[PDB]
């Protein structure tokens, strides 16, 4: 579908710009896409508001989450070598999606010599 390509190209654009988080947020009038490229939030695209439900649905099925359940928070995973952690949550104008993009010695980690 056209929506499947849009989410895939958006993820490619997120890796292009060096984004850590992708923020899909639905308001009453507008739908907004934002990346947090290096800790700074950024406007990237404001598509048609009608697409809200389809973008939420596509990102759910990629992370193997419930499509029809729009009343509780759902957290899932995807492997594209980019490991993403999607997190959906209920709101006033539908769900709000955020997917954190993470790339895939014991002493260096923290342990002392003893």
């Amino acid at each position: 579908a056209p929506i499947i390509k849009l989410i895939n190209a958006m993820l490619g654009e997120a890796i292009k710009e060096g984004a850590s988080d992708i923020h899909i947020e639905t308001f009453e009038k507008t739908l907004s896409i934002r990346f947090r490229v290096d800790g700074v939030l950024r406007e990237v695209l404001a598509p048609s508001r009608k697409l809200s439900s389809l973008l939420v649905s596509r990102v759910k099925v990629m992370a193997k989450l419930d499509i029809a359940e729009k009343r509780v928070p759902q957290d899932g995973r995807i492997s594209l070598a980019v490991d993403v952690r999607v997190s959906t949550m209920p709101s006033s104008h539908g769900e709000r999606v955020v997917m954190r993009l993470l790339d895939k010695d014991l002493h260096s980690l923290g342990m002392t010599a003893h």
Binding site: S20, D21, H23, E25, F27, E28, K29, R34, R36, V40, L41, E43, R71, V72, P73, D75, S87, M89, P90, S91, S92, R96, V98, R100
Partner: protein
């Protein structure tokens, strides 16, 4: 008072509480604070019970008992959306306060309310629920008795 509140709500992290009795206009003060912060450079999200009105540009989740979506679970969900500032309706119990204290220490600016008669009553109230006396000193930026 505005300039002092401005600087406090514009800090990168910490808890700011607004206290007083019922019908003291706490929400109105919080809503005014969020609207002042409402910029394109920050991600602001809220958990409310119920949502008083809609701020355009700010995310606002409602406490839904039909799906067991509580303040604690709602606040725990908001923290996974990569927020800069968070506004909790009110911290009624220990579990919700524990998450708000962790939120404040972990780089988020937290905002909430408590039904206490004095500004010291808010610091008081956090000590009562079971927040370690220390954790209040590190996280708390200020209290607004209104």
């Amino acid at each position: 008072n505005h300039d002092n509140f401005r600087r406090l709500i514009k800090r990168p992290h910490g808890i700011i509480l607004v206290t007083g009795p019922t019908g003291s206009g706490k929400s109105t003060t919080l809503y005014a604070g969020l609207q002042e912060l409402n910029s394109s450079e920050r991600n602001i999200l809220t958990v409310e019970d119920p949502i008083e009105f809609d701020i355009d540009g700010i995310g606002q989740t409602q406490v839904n008992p039909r799906v067991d979506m509580t303040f604690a679970r709602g606040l725990r969900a908001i923290l996974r959306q990569d927020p800069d500032v968070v506004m909790v309706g009110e911290i009624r119990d220990l579990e919700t306060a524990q998450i708000a204290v962790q939120a404040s220490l972990t780089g988020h600016l937290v905002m909430s309310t408590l039904h206490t008669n004095t500004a010291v009553g808010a610091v008081t109230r956090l000590r009562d629920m079971g927040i370690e006396p220390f954790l209040i000193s590190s996280s708390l930026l200020g209290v607004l008795a209104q």
